[PDB]
Design an enzyme around this catalytic site. Structure first.
Site, short mmCIF file in Angstrom:
data_model
loop_
_atom_site.label_atom_id
_atom_site.label_comp_id
_atom_site.label_asym_id
_atom_site.label_seq_id
_atom_site.Cartn_x
_atom_site.Cartn_y
_atom_site.Cartn_z
N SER A 81 -9.17 80.26 8.46
CA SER A 81 -10.11 79.37 8.93
C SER A 81 -9.61 78.51 10.27
CB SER A 81 -10.75 78.32 8.16
OG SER A 81 -12.06 77.93 8.45
N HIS A 236 -16.11 81.81 1.98
CA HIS A 236 -15.31 81.54 2.69
C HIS A 236 -13.75 81.34 2.01
CE1 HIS A 236 -13.84 79.71 6.37
NE2 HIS A 236 -13.41 78.63 5.87
CL LIG Z 1 -11.15 75.03 8.80
#
Ligand SMILES: [Cl-]
Ligand SMILES: [Cl-]
Lengths: 259, 259
Positions: A81, A236
């Site tokens: 991320s 995610h």
């Molecule tokens: Cl992040």
């Protein structure tokens, strides 16, 4: 026996090293070495985010981890991320210590636009932040935008394919953080000689509700990678929802960078 | 449908609320409310242990949790390891808010000897600290003794029957802590009218390698309980090694104090 590798794992904003607690033993049982970095003001780091006013300060524990490696050792550097930004900052400092960068559900910056560019692009079209709390902190470096994820936002957009226990753990451990967008917008552009010289792959989850597959293709089209791997069914938090399938992807990368 | 309860869960020294990540969803899926307290300088709390010099300051988050309950609400208050000391301290302040104290592999203080008594006994007895790091910090009122678990100690003495991922997670999150022995030695004895009035039960793991099954018997012999529950095959960290069996024990306790 096949030569094993040292993986250096870099977590996302608002989280910490703990996110790798399922992946790390899978890699170590395969004979690899793992270092799970704890960035500043992350996890059990003793500083609050308010004391970490720049992305370089944020990233310092990763730079230190690379600086401390024995001579001629090279790692597989995995950024998750916002971790993509940290690994790119690391590769502009110690390119020769990195066998391959692995962008995992990650921001993938380029060397043409300001270092904030792909974050700015996402923040423009992000969809909802839900119950996430945004606050500002005024510093000598200017105003820092802080966020604290809310638990409904976590559940819907980050953790929706994770076991309930992992979501509860996350509730217990996540912290106020920052994407350092102001600071990234002023920083010198990442270099082609440093960052751009290092080998890079992308690993995407197919159900990432934060970093959707169209935005990833855009990033890659701005800044090509040598291969793309997809984790079917990952959210995610793919290291929590699909740790084995993530292991498999990492293993396949490691077999490509024997040498 | 039979009545559900609010369980307040209190972690051990050098850990934090995260230890309860498995147990919490088991208890909530059965219709109970759970509050997993983070004590001072624990988990992601922002203080260092050095800043928290007294057991009262350490326990503040638990006292605040109890204070904030609506009028006439009563909880099942579970204290794990050092957490036994915290729940006795709470029971001396708010006995009417507590339906029953559950001493989970815990220190079980009395109302006769100084509050540090059972801690001082274990410290005389126990010869397995291994690679634990002991240290002091001088405060304006006295020496404060500190400890940081070592990883070998953890594996052998606390986590030996846990999944490897749990042990990895614990390596990622444990912190320097304290048993506050000096402060507890100076404190007023626990009282009969507060702590000693509250109903209390003990839940013991059969393979606890830091709070030995003979020492548990010694404490209970010194200060009796209504009932003893045993979790077969649990190590010290029984909420991680045997979370369904612990849920069974707590579910039995709730049925004996039902209301
Ligand atoms: Cl992040
Ligand atoms: Cl403890």
């Amino acid at each position: 026996m096949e030569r094993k590798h040292h993986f250096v794992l870099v977590h996302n904003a608002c989280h910490g090293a703990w996110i790798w607690y399922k992946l790390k033993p899978l890699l170590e049982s395969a004979g690899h070495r793992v270092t799970a970095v704890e960035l500043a003001a992350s996890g059990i780091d003793p500083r609050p985010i308010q004391a970490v006013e720049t992305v370089d300060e944020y990233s310092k524990p990763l730079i230190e981890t690379l600086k401390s490696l024995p001579e001629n050792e090279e790692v597989i550097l995995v950024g998750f991320s916002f971790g993509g930004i940290n690994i790119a900052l690391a590769a502009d400092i110690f390119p020769a210590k990195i066998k391959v960068l692995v962008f995992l559900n990650a921001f993938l910056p380029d060397t043409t636009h300001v270092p904030s560019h792909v974050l700015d692009k996402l923040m423009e079209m992000f969809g909802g932040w839900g119950d996430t709390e945004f606050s500002s902190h005024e510093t000598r470096n200017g105003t820092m935008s802080l966020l604290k994820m809310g638990p409904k936002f976590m559940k819907a957009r980050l953790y929706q394919n994770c076991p309930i226990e992992d979501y509860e753990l996350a509730k217990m451990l996540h912290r106020q953080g920052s994407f350092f967008t102001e600071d990234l917008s002023k920083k010198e552009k990442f270099s082609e000689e440093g960052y751009g010289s290092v080998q890079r792959v992308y690993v995407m989850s197919s159900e990432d509700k934060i970093i959707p597959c169209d935005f990833i293709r855009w990033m890659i089209d701005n800044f090509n990678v040598s291969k793309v791997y997809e984790i079917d069914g990952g959210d995610h938090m793919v290291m929590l929802s699909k740790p084995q399938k993530l292991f498999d992807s990492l293993s396949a990368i490691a077999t490509d960078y024997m040498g």
